[PDB]
DNA sequence: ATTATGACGCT
DNA sequence: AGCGTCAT
């Protein structure tokens with residue numbers, strides 16, 4: 524009852540860029556705007572691999588992970604932009620720099636947590652309190668929420684989408700009690716007003732469109748963001764959760780899309796997030812562990828406590844390359860050349876990071892894959908990173924892996940290497 | 954031959 | 965620490 528926490532203490536948003544790498548390329552090349560188009564890396568094998576897809580191209584069935592040659596079968600007029608290649612490898616600098624553009628704008632409104640190259644969480648609780656005082660019990664006009672969906676509305680007593688959006692928004696606003704400055708529903712609504720402003724700023728100042736979710740925690744904000752993309756934002760209220768979750772496949776919730784989620788389904792014999800409410804906390808802890816069990820117990824009621832962490836910058840800087848099939852590295856000269864290529868990109872990025880962000884990395888992680896292993900990584904070893912020098916880092920990396928070589932001959936490398944990875948970690952202020 | 958990342962959990 | 969899981 525009255526002591527039952529409802530997880531309505533915070534206002535959290537998740538802002539996620541629409542088809543991000545495609546928009547970056549469309550800004551640069553106007554010929555790609557408002558077209559079926561995709562971003563591809565490499566070229567020789569099956570036309571390259573698609574990693575981002577415009578919404579026009581999605582209508583033809585083009586998806587991420589698809590080979591471009593196959594995408595062209597679905598969409599003959601598909602336009603393609605290629606990821607830059609430097610030092611023999613794909614280089615994602617353009618997209619990292621475009622990410623910084625957006626993150627810095629978001630940071631003007633609130634402290635953000637960078638969750639990926641194209642999305643960040645926002646804790647808007649304090650900003651909402653501030654705006655609520657400015658409003659002075661003034662109702663929120665629908666005009667302040669021009670791209671907002673209210674999940675679950677309209678209900679009860681019609682065929683256009685924009686019309687449906689406004690119907691839902693009007694039902695929501697009509698029910699709002701703006702007299703209570705601690706009403707969670709009102710707080711979410713003001714949160715949505717701020718996120719409209721945030722999204723307008725991003726589009727004005729970068730040219731990039733995005734979607735957003737507004738709710739009381741990160742998992743619901745993330746889920747919300749996806750409901751109406753692209754170029755729209757969605758408010759998921761605490762009250763909307765029972766209906767929303769009653770038909771929501773468990774795999775849709777962030778962190779449940781893999782083995783744990785499959786285990787929840789298998790062990791409990793359920794399909795939807797809402798079905799979790801019928802288990803005790805102890806029951807869930809018994810199957811999935813203390814931490815997961817408590818997290819699931821709360822999550823299926825719309826409650827989550829994970830904080831928005833004040834972190835705008837990545838914690839690591841890494842540079843990775845696969846060497847598939849026949850291209851696997853089978854000579855020491857090969858291995859050394861590619862370690863140097865990776866190290867040179869790493870040095871470049873590290874030097875820029877040090878200048879921009881007043882920090883220095885102190886640990887170098889080296890990872891490889893050997894031909895045969897189905898795991899992402901076969902071996903991961905750390906050594907000290909004491910100088911931002913590519914030849915030193917590549918020599919050090921070679922030192923830490925050189926005994927993985929099964930070959931009795933040391934000119935040759937066996938089993939051939941199908942992946943190399945260098946990562947700088949453990950930053951200190953400088 | 955679904956690549957290049959990047960965070961956090963376990964023991 | 966080195967590995968695994970999940971994610972974008």
Ligand SMILES: Nc1ncnc2c1ncn2[C@H]1C[C@H](O)[C@@H](COP(=O)(O)OP(=O)(O)OP(=O)(O)O)O1
Pocket residue numbers: 539540541542543544545574575576587640641752753956957972
């Ligand atoms: N598996 C991947 N491999 C390489 N790059 C990826 C992968 N997934 C995502 N990216 C990159 C390209 C994306 O444009 C960018 C953001 O990813 P994501 O938010 O999942 O999709 P998206 O922004 O392209 O479309 P959406 O509008 O559906 O969000 O990160």
Ligand SMILES: [Ca+2]
Pocket residue numbers: 539540541542543641
């Ligand atoms: Ca996105």
Ligand SMILES: [Mn+2]
Pocket residue numbers: 539540639641642972
């Ligand atoms: Mn994203």
